[PDB]
Amino acid sequence: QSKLGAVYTEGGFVEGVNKKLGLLGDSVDIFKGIPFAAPTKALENPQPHPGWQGTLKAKNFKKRCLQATITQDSTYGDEDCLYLNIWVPQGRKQVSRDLPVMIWIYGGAFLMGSGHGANFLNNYLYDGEEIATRGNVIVVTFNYRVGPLGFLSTGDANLPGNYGLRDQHMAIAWVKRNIAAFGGDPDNITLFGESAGGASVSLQTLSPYNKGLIRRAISQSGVALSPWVIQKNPLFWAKKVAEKVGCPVGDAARMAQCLKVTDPRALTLAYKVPLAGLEYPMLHYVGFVPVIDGDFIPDDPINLYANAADIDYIAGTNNMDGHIFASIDMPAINKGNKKVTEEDFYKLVSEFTITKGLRGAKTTFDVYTESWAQDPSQENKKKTVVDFETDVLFLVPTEIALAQHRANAKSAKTYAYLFSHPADHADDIQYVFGKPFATPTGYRPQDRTVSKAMIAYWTNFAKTGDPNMGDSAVPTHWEPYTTENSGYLEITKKMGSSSMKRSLRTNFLRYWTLTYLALPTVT
Ligand SMILES: [Zn+2]
């Protein structure tokens, strides 16, 4: 009477595990490996999963979708991968009902990842237990297809792409139809995700496929407007794969059907992004990502924000999000005894501004190195390289998305954040998921303070659309974003009234959205 037991879903009964928590009667019901769609076919849209007889034992994580290992030498996962996982918190007197529902979408550059995440200190990163029990919400995680098997496309109807986005949508629709049986409120679904997952969250809110399914959304370090998200030239990348696996490249239809019957492991390993050295910035080699298909993504995402008019929305970034691509594009920023020079940075800037030619390279170099005259230290120069990559890859897209969502808002609220700290220790995911509480030996008291506050804001928002209002106290009043106030919450170790800030790097946002765009395109 205080836990779920066998749950009747549309496919049949499902049995999970009840984990007792604390000493006074709380617990958590955990379901792992519930199928939400059929075994996948290579480069075909997902399909309903047939029902089952008896009681499905949802006791273990299932296989991730077929993908390259990080050494890009081999593969793991399986074509039968579309499974989801659920954490339902339980109090000590009665079974939970009408709980808010948060669906996590993992990142991994659309190339790798799974619903459980990396394992460290005997804990999966996306283990939803700490969010669910501390915020009194239901947490869902799930697998979607990645890499060529998730995103290969010819840019036309022969191979329209976006298979992995359709997988995500199928998981969302399943939760909407079924989660009330677990104690969830299906009218109150919040998506959240990071990096490619944050851009996926954003894409899901913009797609007409999700009309009436999504109540709220959180984009962490990634939005549909980031430059690494939409592949403008998919036929080029599909031809690359066709040549390495021996398919003809003359006719799009013939090539498409050849790829569909190619060993999916050969498809997955067809292309390896070089590690070093590269002729172009890292951004150039993001290949198999979403496309504008005129269907799931009917138009350029910038034109789609009417679809999110009643979806409350949080979006934010990490202060040094770009350090990942910056280290690859300029390895000197990590080597303490190697210099970054004006010539190195010009070269990097010029590669990002090719469409505006020499003038575009100069105006950008000039604005980012303005501070170098008074502070020529390597510390200031290397920080500048990171800030540049953060701005173009994360911050500027995110600010444009916030502005677009606010301008199209009807009932929707809009919120902005900057996460500042001090895998790497600076990253948001581990604090959002409560890792400092689940594996506390690896973390210090200040880490639990930050994670406690992030889970409070996130789960208050899931409950009410107001990060300040819900089951948890918060340290700083988080003011909704408007064009006039342009406010963001700076999330740090010690928060108070001055944590609510405004006008994040506005001179740089204005440069990219006004000055740079006013330059003539060269050819
Ligand atoms: Zn199955």
Ligand SMILES: [Zn+2]
């Ligand atoms: Zn696994």
Ligand SMILES: [Zn+2]
């Ligand atoms: Zn198999």
Ligand SMILES: [Zn+2]
């Ligand atoms: Zn009810």
Ligand SMILES: [Zn+2]
């Ligand atoms: Zn649908």
Ligand SMILES: [Zn+2]
């Ligand atoms: Zn390029």
Ligand SMILES: [Zn+2]
């Ligand atoms: Zn170039």
Ligand SMILES: [Zn+2]
């Ligand atoms: Zn992150």
Ligand SMILES: [Zn+2]
């Ligand atoms: Zn990071």
Ligand SMILES: [Zn+2]
């Ligand atoms: Zn820390």
Ligand SMILES: [Zn+2]
């Ligand atoms: Zn207020």
